[PDB]
Symmetry: C3
Subunit: 81 residues, 3 copies
Amino acid sequence: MKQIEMKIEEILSKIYHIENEIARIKKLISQKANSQDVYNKTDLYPKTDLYTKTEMDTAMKQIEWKIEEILSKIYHIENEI
Amino acid sequence: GMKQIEMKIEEILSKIYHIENEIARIKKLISQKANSQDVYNKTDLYPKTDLYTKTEMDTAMKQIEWKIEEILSKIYHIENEIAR
Amino acid sequence: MKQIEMKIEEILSKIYHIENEIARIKKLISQKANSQDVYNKTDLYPKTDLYTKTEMDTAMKQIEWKIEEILSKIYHIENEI
């Protein structure tokens, strides 16, 4: 009988400690990202494989610059005719 | 005090039942979290704000092809003018 | 009495297993991504909504064609004058 009563208390202690761990785990869990709210590495391209807005604005301007270049000749050439 | 031991046993069981439920829930939730191994960090990626989509690019480009067409038609005409 | 001692042992068994699960959970938790260290799906575009560098370099080369067409004419036409 004295042993059972002692074991009861030991179990209760373990229960208290488990409940404390559970609370801590829940706090940490809530700081983790849900896979639902993120894309995997397979759903995405890295920085290295992509142009940003500016890199695109640059590439596009490269085309517009040559268009301007040509515009400046055309109207000189028509006026030369 | 057998009835009394039995009473503490019941109290324990109830706590145990609940802990078991929590554990099952936590494991479900854990399995919906993303492994840092399977994701790029913020430093390995650009945000929405720093990128153009495909359609925004396809849009910008066809606008560019419209001006090119325009300029082609001035050139054609200048070639034909000279010609005579 | 033998029944109470037998239930105690059943409880201890449950406790053993819960403790094992708790340790495991903590291990898995530590392999998860902090939401602080990632962008969500709303802060990003997927592979499907973006052109890579080569896809862009490809799309641009059709435009550079036409530019080369015109520039090459202009310069022999200026001589022709």
